[PDB]
Amino acid sequence: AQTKATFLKLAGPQLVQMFIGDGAKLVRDAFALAKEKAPSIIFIDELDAIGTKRFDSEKAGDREVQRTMLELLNQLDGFQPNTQVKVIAATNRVDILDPALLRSGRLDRKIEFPMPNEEARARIMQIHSRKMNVSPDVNYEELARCTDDFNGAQCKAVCVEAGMIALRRGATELTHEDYMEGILEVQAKKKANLQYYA
Amino acid sequence: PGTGKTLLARAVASQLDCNFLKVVSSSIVDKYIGESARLIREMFNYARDHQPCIIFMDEIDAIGGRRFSEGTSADREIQRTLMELLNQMDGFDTLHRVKMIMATNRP
Amino acid sequence: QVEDDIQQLLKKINELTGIKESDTGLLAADKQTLQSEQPLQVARCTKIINADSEDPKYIINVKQFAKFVVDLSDQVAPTDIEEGMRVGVDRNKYQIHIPLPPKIDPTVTMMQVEEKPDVTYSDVGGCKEQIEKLREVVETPLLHPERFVNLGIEPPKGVLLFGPPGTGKTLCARAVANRTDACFIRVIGSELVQKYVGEGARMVRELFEMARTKKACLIFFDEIDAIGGARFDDGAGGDNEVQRTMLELINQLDGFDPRGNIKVLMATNRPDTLDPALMRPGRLDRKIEFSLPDLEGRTHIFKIHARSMSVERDIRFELLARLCPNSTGAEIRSVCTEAGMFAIRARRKIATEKDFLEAVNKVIKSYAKFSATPRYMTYN
Amino acid sequence: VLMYGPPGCGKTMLAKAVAHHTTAAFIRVVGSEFVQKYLGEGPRMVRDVFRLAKENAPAIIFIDEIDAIATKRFDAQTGADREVQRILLELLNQMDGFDQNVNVKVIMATNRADTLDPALLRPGRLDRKIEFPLPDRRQKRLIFSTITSKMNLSEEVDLEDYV
Amino acid sequence: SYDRAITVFSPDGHLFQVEYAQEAVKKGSTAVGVRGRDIVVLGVEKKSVAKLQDERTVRKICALDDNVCMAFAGLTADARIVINRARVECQSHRLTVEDPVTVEYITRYIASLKQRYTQSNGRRPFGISALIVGFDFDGTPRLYQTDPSGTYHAWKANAIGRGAKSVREFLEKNYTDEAIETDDLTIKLVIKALLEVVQSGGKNIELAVMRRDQSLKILNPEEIEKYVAEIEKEKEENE
Amino acid sequence: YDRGVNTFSPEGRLFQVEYAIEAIKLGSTAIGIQTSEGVCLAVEKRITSPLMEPSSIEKIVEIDAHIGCAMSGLIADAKTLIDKARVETQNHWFTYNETMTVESVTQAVSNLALQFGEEDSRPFGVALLFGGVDEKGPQLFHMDPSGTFVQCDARAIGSASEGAQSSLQEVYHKSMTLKEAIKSSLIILKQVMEEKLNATNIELATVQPGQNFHMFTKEELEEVIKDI
Amino acid sequence: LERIKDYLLMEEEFIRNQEQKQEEERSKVDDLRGTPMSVGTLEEIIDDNHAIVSTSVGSEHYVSILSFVDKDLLEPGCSVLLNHKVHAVIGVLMDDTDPLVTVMKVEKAPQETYADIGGLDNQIQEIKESVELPLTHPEYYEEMGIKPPKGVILYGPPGTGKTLLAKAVANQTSATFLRVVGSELIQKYLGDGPKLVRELFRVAEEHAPSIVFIDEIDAIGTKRYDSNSGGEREIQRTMLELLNQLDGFDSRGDVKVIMATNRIETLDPALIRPGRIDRKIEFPLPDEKTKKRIFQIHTSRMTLADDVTLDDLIMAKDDLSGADIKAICTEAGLMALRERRMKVTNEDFKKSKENVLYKKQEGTPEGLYL
Amino acid sequence: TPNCRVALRNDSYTLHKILPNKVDPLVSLMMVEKVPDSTYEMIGGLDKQIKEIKEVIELPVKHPELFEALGIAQPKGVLLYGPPGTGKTLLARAVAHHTDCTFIRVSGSELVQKFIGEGARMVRELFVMAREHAPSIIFMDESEVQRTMLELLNQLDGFEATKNIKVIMATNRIDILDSALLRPGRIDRKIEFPPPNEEARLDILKIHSRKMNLTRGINLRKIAELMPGASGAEVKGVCTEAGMYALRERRVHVTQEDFEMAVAKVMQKDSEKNMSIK
Ligand SMILES: Nc1ncnc2c1ncn2[C@@H]1O[C@H](COP(=O)(O)OP(=O)(O)OP(O)(O)=S)[C@@H](O)[C@H]1O
């Protein structure tokens, strides 16, 4: 949204195709099309769909996935280097991948994502609640201090379910108890089990 | 991985500078029946003629494999494409000055 | 030689009757339109790679033959002949006529519902919280955007369902479809079970490409266990095609300019073995579940399954609802139909509460305790 | 005949020595040769092979890597499996009934004796089952005595102590 | 959760080998037992004489004392060990308190041993179910049965082995109030049970009696032929 | 998985104890109600055959002269526990010339209700109701296979315990009387049973401080049945 | 002596079966049809008198319909008649009567009717009022307004008459019958079970009201094969597709689904619940009295002397079946042709009795128990 | 006719003529098999099982009238069991030869499945080739093959058409195949296969050696008592490699010492003791 380079997206399973060898065609033509528009930012989504710790076995094995991955790697790095490609990849898990997918600088800057500790929770609540009309009798720091270990989407669910919990009344703008009951839906994972622990 | 297995052959590709047919060995198979076998025949004829040729096939394990108990059908033509190399690297007509440089991620 | 005679010469009289009958035997609707349609045109359809600049100069592969530089006929809309747009092309002149909507799939267009089953919210009694929250999610923003946008809040795109087998996931899903006012789409979770690699990716593709064109539509997933439980890793390469199908479903579900105006209702009978990538909200917000009918909702299900039958008025409903705490509405339906069948075993026309006694004391004993058989005390 | 075994036991090498010391016509056949771009070349190629085999002589053909042809499993919807299937059928129907007298000798050779249809290893088709096993202590001594005769060999270096 | 082992439950609260070990009894030979008012009598079926050997060693009805009588089902070896232990238990009880051994105490012993044998680590439970008949307290006829779980369970008549539901169902339609005594009617009751047996071959019937005061008496295959003859006479008189 | 007593769950818990609590459910029901006049108690026998002699199946046994019991589940684990309590009560009277109170009885039973161990066997499969009169009046006591013992005022067990507890909390309050609680209990019994209530189906066990001996009702229970 | 009428009627039947212009408008429609009337396949239908077809190799055209045969006959996924000259859609072709129909759609009411039972007359009445009365006389569902019961389960010992009752409902029938053996639902590919489920029950749903009978369905949960790709994480997918197929959506139709098992314990509790299956039906080995009815029926058309009592074959064995009694009859016939007699005597029954009880019911080598 | 080539013109697509010599599909599957074609004169050394399978197969074929006269149900599945090499396949082939029934061996191939239908969904198009080729004897080898046999026998028992449709499976290890399969109203005549005894090995030797070029002067019972029990096709190997032993000494006559070497050649099947234990 902010930068204005030739930006390019890519999903994981969109690469592997029913026939044998079409992923090589697809990734090679993708690199060509991005290279002919040199300020090129390639976005990769779910690399772990095609990134796999490969295996030697018998009687079974799914091969062409590693063929498309080796296409990606070799046309990415090594012989015939390029200077104008920019890569952004995003996975949800890590150790599925080959070490030759990274190693140091197949992808260079290894960047993890932390979860909101305490303060960024109230920050994210403020961000998504910026559009709603609030009767501002709300300490968001209370809410960030009670909701432990949520993501941004769970705080968004808090925000929207608080809006429609206020709309259960339907009369007016947001109250603090609207946020409380939004939490009380987003919280659990309900247990309530309880037994043998006296 | 990352020991510069590529760049050593690339340094040879900046030392002899003769006929480096650096096959990436992943963009060979496209979709068809016997096209890859014909490309292998073409490379071996071309290497036979231009007498100082250097064969280089990076990331072999995609096209190599080992063997199967006959699972996915495309693996049949994979193994035939590999047995193309298995025959015509040795055959009966022995190659001459056909030096093959090979690199892998897991051998 | 009685029945032998009978069969033999009766079939012989039949055959001899047939022999003399085998011997005794010896438009303007649209035709002129069709002769006017021999001056019609063959109109082979094709596919477009790309245009050129300042001039059409269209580059087309048919589907199979080759690739050609062609030019349009002058009877086209000279704008809407864009890339990937399947168009009809002349045989001889290779000139283009009209774009038509593309290949959808050979058998994925065949899962739009194309009807509306008469399952009604009134038949799904005992889950009034589930009824009202499902109302709030699905029925309200898609028909009456009155309160959501006018304050500036969003409707939730995602809702999950599970519960005891026999509770009304089927009922709620079919019950929306009476009052859908939307392009409801059925998806079995086993539809992604194909032979060929990466085909479920194409399935998710054509699902959402049917979703995007027509606006304000419903897509119903069902039994999403087969879509995949987790992201298992082992040295043998097991659940992979299912896994990539699952992740592609996550991506073309939501992310990087997401879905738009689609509501997806998901159901399963084993939600605990689901990956967190589906479980994280935004993808699915309200995790609405089902419980057992614990109270006079049971009696309301009795009233549903009894209001369509002429009964004895001298009956109660809460007594048998006491006698079925753990039971499901499917088991309630079986008991009500079974008692009606007991009344049809009799030559009456109106049942008894004792017919309900027969149904209870026959089903819950014979087919909730003889499967499996006990032949041992050990307990009592 | 059929050759197999641990691969690297000179399976090609006996065919080498036979072809050098044969007399009649000798055809080598690439096992992967038959699957080619034209849709139908294979049966005509097998007919070329066997018509020439009956045509010449009581001659010898050596077909190595027949595992490229011999694969027991197929899938009759891909299309590419069906030509391999009919290449096997073309081979089968022209194997049992040559002439019973035209002594064509087709030496088949793989390394893997797993992916072979039991309809191939039949009496009349391939009677003998011959492996090339790994050598032992004295065969390696004899192999060393053969191979080391070409190098100049500083003659007080014993190689039996590495066997 | 699985058929191994004996130690863990099912997820719905069962023991597989406890439930499965009764099937070895349920596929076993049939042996019935009733109580009279004064004379108690029982018997096994399927003598199965295989024409070339003796059968005095295969006797499935024995005694621990002069006051108690045995029967079993399932496999024979567990019955051998349990009875050989129970004799020593009866005699150790006699070495203690000088009463004739009550049927209730020895059934508690056998079922208790069987249960604490089952609870232990990897011991295959005795797949038998014994019939323990005695009349001790002023000649009060008692018969208890056992279980592979080890539950003594007092009856008035009993039927185990193959097809025990049908054989017990005959005693449901047979056992009115005025059975005994009337010892002759108890005799004919045992005879009608043997006629209602799953095969009722006529010569494979082996029955033993106790008049609550005497010893165990093994009968003779001519008295039983007279019993089958008078039972067929009663069937003809029903016509 | 869960495969044995020596392995927790990722969330809790046993996962052997849970299957023992599940193995409570198979048994026949029983109901006891604590009343300050005295503890009343009831059970179902679930007779199979007419040959099955009804007074032979034990449900209420006598541990002490003022302490009753009722069993729910596996018969023989219950018999072992009754045996141990019968030993231990007598040892307490031996070493103290007094009656072991029923809470201390239950602590003694629940000392090895969970001492389950195969090395260094399985946990037991019965839940038990204890009724008795200590110095503080009558006591009604409810334990479990897991040894988590607590007092209950009117506990119901076994099969159909849910609606039993429901209709029990419907009818119960603190100041009940004796025969009212007796008929209130047997109403719930004939609501949860499948057979016609008669003299052979159920049995009562009534202990009172002035009527300590004979915690049983024999065929006057017929007269109690016919009053409904 | 009945061979004469048999052969003559058979030949007359064959010859009369082999016994199979004025209209000018019909000939003009013939002349609107080509002489090489080619054949194609549809993709989509457009209302403007022409639609899109596909050729054999994959050429596709906008070609119009000869409109005397209706376009409502045309559905996506049909084989049509095409021209050569403008390739116009000529008419409707009769469909590919695929080997699923020729294998599964049994046209034949197989064998003896409800007079071939043993120990029945309640379960007959159950399957009658649960299938036939919804089929033949559903006027009582008008009279009350209640759903018919849906699913039927036959379970008991092997040789009880699961096969016999399956042939009985297919005997008295007026609907299309389908039959599947439950061991077929695993193939040597990944994902072939759900395709079988969908095409099977689509063909079941397309023709008419019908009856689907599947037998030995327990052979999918407790069976493993080396001839299996994937495995349990494809067996579960097969089960889950059949799960959605049976208790799914969209007014499933008048297709009575009847199942039959030997064992019952290893089955999904989600598949024996009602909604799917409303009439579970016990098959016990019924009684020692209708042993005589099966001896009566299975010897109703064979000459036999008196010479025996069936009570001798009642007091021999404790478990009873038609698999017992028919084996007794066949082995008695083997002993009859062994001793070249008719009017079967007692010694054939005795040796047949002993040899059939031994082969097979004993268990296991001595001993054990005894 | 169904599936017949005809001469079709190319311009107007008019029928020209009928083309002969259509397909030969069962012949094609037969040539996929190449079973040892047999007759009675070669399975000597035993005639009991031959008479059993005569009584159970030739008698349904030659005389359906004798079965249908007394009104009995004819047998339809004969399970055979025994060790390999005792003529588990020569037997059924000689039976089907001396009754002229269409012999069928559906073993395990995609060749087979592609020639039944197109390997489409199941095997029950063999029933199409069973009824239409009504003298049908089907043969199977040694848990999937049994599953296919279970499908076949679950339809052909009384829920199908005119007989002479009988299947034959000959294997070992009788208990691993199903017991519901061995329901007595499903499989009748379980016929054992013996190891070849001394005179039986003698007769096998006389058959597999009679057609060769012997030395003038030979004995056979000594050779028959050398073997402690071979298979059927081991004695053939004995004879042919004794002929090889004759030809390596540049002779065409086969003495006894060729057999003395061939017995030792086949003897490497079993040796190896310090294994008596047992
Ligand atoms: N509350 C209810 N009221 C009325 N009918 C009900 C109710 N609950 C269940 N049913 C009946 O039970 C069936 C409902 O479908 P379900 O069995 O719930 O399908 P399902 O929820 O998808 O279960 P699965 O497929 O095992 S996850 C129909 O027969 C309904 O008539």
Ligand SMILES: Nc1ncnc2c1ncn2[C@@H]1O[C@H](COP(=O)(O)OP(=O)(O)OP(O)(O)=S)[C@@H](O)[C@H]1O
């Ligand atoms: N007995 C031997 N005496 C001398 N040299 C031998 C001997 N055995 C093997 N060799 C040498 O080792 C080589 C054996 O390999 P090849 O003959 O190439 O067999 P092959 O082609 O490798 O068959 P493979 O292993 O399936 S590719 C020969 O070329 C010889 O140089």
